[PDB]
Structure formats: C-alpha cells, structure tokens
Design a binder for these strands. Structure first.
Ligand SMILES: [Ca+2]
Ligand SMILES: [Ca+2]
Lengths: 163, 163
DNA sequence: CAATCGTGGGAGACCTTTGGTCTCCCTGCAGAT
DNA sequence: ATCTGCAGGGTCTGGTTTCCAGACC
DNA sequence: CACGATTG
C-alpha cells in the first residue's frame, strides 16, 4: 500500500509512495539560523509537521528512515546535526501517526546493488530515475541525491525491484 | 497563564505551571537500547508525545526549552545525544501545539543568581524547592536536579521571583 | 537504588558465522563556476 | 544557483557592541 | 552533557 521514506539530513527529502504507483518527494524544509556569529541551515520543524499532516498516507503508514550513523572522523558538529535531524524527524513522524522503521544505509544500498560505487550519489539518482521515471526531471542535478535516497528508501520498504 | 519548561537531556524533566499556581514535573521517559553491542539510555519518543497529549495546558502555551550547547571537549557521542534529545523534544512540543522558546542555561541561571556556584546542581534543587515548595519532596535526591532545572526554566518563562 | 568519578568515546549488517570483516554517511566552510 | 573540495570544527549573553569577556552543560 | 565505570 502506502510507504514513506525519509532521508533526514539538511539536503534530504521525504518520499511518499501511494498504492496506485504514484509518488511524491519533497525537499526537507529548512531555515537559516545564526549560530556563533555565522549562518547555519537547520531543518524547519513547523514546516515538516505541516507537510506530514498534509499527506494522504493513512495513519499507521510505515515510514522508513535512514539510521543516523556519522563517522568517527566526522566532526562533533556533524555528530550534533545528524543527531538533531534524526530526533526531529522521528518525533515528527511518530506524532503525525506513522510507524517509524529505522533502516541502515547499507541495507537499502545492498538491496539495490549500490554498495562500493565510486560515484554513489550519481548511481542513487540513476536508480531512483529508473524506479520512478516520472521523477526523472526532479533528479537531474547532483544536489538531488537526497531526493533519490528518500525515494529508494521508500522503494525498499515497498519491495520494488530494478528491471 | 500556563508555562512549560523542558530540560531535554536523558536525566531531564518537563515542568508544567498552571495559572492557579499548581505545578507538575515529570522525569523524561527513556528506554534502554542497544548501540554497537552496548546498552545506552535513550528518550522514549512515544511516551513523550503521549505525555504532552495528556497535559491540560492548552495549544499555544509556550514551552521554554534549554538550548543544547555541548562543550568542545565533550565527545562526539555527547554531541549527537544532545542534538538528538533537543530535536526529539522540539518536534514533540511543536507537534503537540506548543510554542517553543529556546533559553540558554546562562540566561535562567543569571536570572536566579546561580552562576559560578560551586554546587550548581544542589543550588538548582534549592532554588526550585523555594519557588515550588509543594515539590520539595520531589527534589530531595541529587539526581532530581533535572526536575529542578525544568521547574526553573518554567519559572523563568513565567517571570517568578525568588524571595 | 543513589551517588561519584574521569574523560570525551562509531555503528551496522552479514560472513568468514558465537568473532570477523566490510561497509556507510554527514557538516561546515571556502573557492571557483 | 550549482558544484566541488576538504577537513572534521562551540556556543551563548551582555558588557563599553562594532569585539571582548566570561559563562554554560 | 554522554558514557562507562566504581562506590556507598
Ligand atoms: Ca542524504
Ligand atoms: Ca539537565
């Protein structure tokens, strides 16, 4: 039936697959914030909750969210933001009535044969283009790799296969 | 006339002040989970949202939450967990209809004259017990300092003054 | 259970299969279109 | 706007605001 | 503050 896929980071996206095969994918809402006298991007909490409440996906629809797992070599700000984004999305999802299933990025990448690519973000958009050809126009730029990741997460949860 | 105060960390608490002067304070619900084959404590997202859904404070009540600001000498896991707790709480509060106001610890501490204390957690419990004497029995233990901080955040947002 | 202490730390899935091996982002900022 | 590369990083409030100083989990 | 441990 209905499946949600969430790529939670600041350039991420939420994809929504309906039972008739149609699909939506929305860039993650964000605002610009002053932190320690510079500008940072931070996810827009009220807009995310508004987006989720506007979905036609019925209550109880499963939302596959990519597990936050920053590298030990990522900096502490990277650890903080990935932590922050993950919690914001998990709480927004649970509160809006969806069942959250965290999925490791290795899990859906292996399902689609995408591990060890030397061009992983191009390949993700490529695979999402094939699974969702009406979204090909929305996946042409390299910055669209979060849209692809959300789409493939939902594709994984629905059990779609590449031809 | 209602004011909410949130200490968002794992040993934190939510305080709820009503216009008639009564007060409630709840320890933050948590669960034990497995991460990297060890046990960690993690905030219980479903119980937080159900707790907020059961409050009598109406929509549009302001919730004062302590701004997460970990120290650069804190480890990256501390950074992730403070980020996660913050985002979980903020989304939970926004989704339950409350208006979130982030407050730095230095702000409410300076307001109650608690800066540079040699026993900061004890003084917080003492200040909260004086502002909310009917919570005195709930502030007896050293580990109740999260209950105190949540109370003091809400007392700050309300504009209460120490005698 | 409650307190105290010292230092700041990956995590996950599956195989080789009760340990071993391999894999995975992200943020923040500058610089060049 | 788009991208690319590279290393992995505090942040906050109120002073004497034009940055400093001192403070915090 | 988290995290992982020991002490009371
Ligand atoms: Ca992503
Ligand atoms: Ca606290």
């Amino acid at each position: 039936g209905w499946v949600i896929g969430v790529d939670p980071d600041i350039g991420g996206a939420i994809a929504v697959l309906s039972p008739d095969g149609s699909s939506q994918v929305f860039d993650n809402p964000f605002v610009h914030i002053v932190v320690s006298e510079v500008i940072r991007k931070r996810l827009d909490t009220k807009s995310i909750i508004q987006l989720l409440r506007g979905l036609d996906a019925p209550p109880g629809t499963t939302a596959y969210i990519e597990k936050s797992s920053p590298f030990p070599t990522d900096g502490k700000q990277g650890w903080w933001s990935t932590g922050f984004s993950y919690g914001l999305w998990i709480a927004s999802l649970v509160a809006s009535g969806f069942s959250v299933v965290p999925i490791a990025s290795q899990t859906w990448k292996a399902y689609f044969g995408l591990m060890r690519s030397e061009t992983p973000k191009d390949d993700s958009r490529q695979a999402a283009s094939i699974l969702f050809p009406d979204k090909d126009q929305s996946l042409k730029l390299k910055k669209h790799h979060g849209r692809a990741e959300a789409l493939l997460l939902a594709a994984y949860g629905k059990g779609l296969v590449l031809p």
